[PDB]
Amino acid sequence: IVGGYTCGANTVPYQVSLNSGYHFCGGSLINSQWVVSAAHCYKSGIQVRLGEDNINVVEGNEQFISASKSIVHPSYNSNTLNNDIMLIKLKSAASLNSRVASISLPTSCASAGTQCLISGWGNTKSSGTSYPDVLKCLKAPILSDSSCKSAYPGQITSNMFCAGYLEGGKDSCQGDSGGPVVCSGKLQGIVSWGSGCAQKNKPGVYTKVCNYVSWIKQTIASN
Numbered sequence: 129i130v131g132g133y134t135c136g137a138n139t140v141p142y143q144v145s146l147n148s149g150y151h152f153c154g155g156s157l158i159n160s161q162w163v164v165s166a167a168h169c170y171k172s173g174i175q176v177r178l179g180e181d182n183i184n185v186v187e188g189n190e191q192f193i194s195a196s197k198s199i200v201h202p203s204y205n206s207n208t209l210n211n212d213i214m215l216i217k218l219k220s221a222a223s224l225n226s227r228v229a230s231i232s233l234p235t236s237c238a239s240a241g242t243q244c245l246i247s248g249w250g251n252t253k254s255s256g257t258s259y260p261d262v263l264k265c266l267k268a269p270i271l272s273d274s275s276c277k278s279a280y281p282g283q284i285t286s287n288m289f290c291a292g293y294l295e296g297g298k299d300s301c302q303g304d305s306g307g308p309v310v311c312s313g314k315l316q317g318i319v320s321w322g323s324g325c326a327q328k329n330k331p332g333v334y335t336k337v338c339n340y341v342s343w344i345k346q347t348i349a350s351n
């Protein structure tokens with residue numbers, strides 16, 4: 129997160145860190161046994177870390193649970209990042225509490241101008257690299273269709289939206305991938321891609337979760 133702020137410990141209780149001996153992606157807890165992340169975050173050997181603030185210190189409140197299943201959308205395209213969504217089933221259910229909590233799926237898509245909360249342990253610099261220990265947050269609005277497509281012509285599918293700031297300075301970034309975009313208490317986006325980070329006229333691009341609510345429920349119900 130570039131241009132954001134320290135969230136505060138466990139203020140984003142649905143935020144998870146995906147770990148492979150290091151933090152490599154974010155995710156969102158949507159019930160005690162399932163996480164939503166980016167298909168481009170797929171790999172073997174995923175450990176889900178819930179309840180985290182400082183990812184480099186065992187502080188209390190952490191739950192480390194191995195992934196049992198990682199289900200990449202069958203129509204994911206690694207070139208266009210269309211359908212950049214993955215469901216991870218935990219080997220055991222998490223213990224839900226004030227610091228480890230699920231986030232609701234949307235009942236409808238969000239509209240342009242809606243303010244949302246984006247969070248993660250990704251890069252905090254727009255030119256170079258600095259990775260934080262504690263969770264970072266950013267308030268960011270959803271952009272209009274036309275503005276999104278003007279920023280990224282021929283690259284925005286119906287399964288993507290733009291959010292952020294055309295003036296630069298405030299954005300998600302590498303390491304935030306798979307993490308939440310939450311708007312009015314609903315999980316509307318997944319950190320997916322962009323051109324650079326926090327660059328002028330190049331806002332972030334997010335997986336449009338409202339298009340996958342039925343896929344998610346059907347897939348979880350059958351697994």
Ligand SMILES: N=C(N)c1ccc(CNC(=O)[C@@H]2CCCN2C(=O)CNC2CCCCC2)cc1
Binds near residue numbers: 303
């Ligand atoms: N909101 C941002 N600006 C942002 C950007 C990137 C990421 C992480 N996602 C990624 O890195 C995804 C994986 C496949 C390649 N990809 C990219 O985003 C491609 N980024 C380049 C495209 C051409 C212009 C230079 C930058 C997360 C957020």
Ligand SMILES: [Ca+2]
Binds near residue numbers: 182183184185187188
């Ligand atoms: Ca910790």
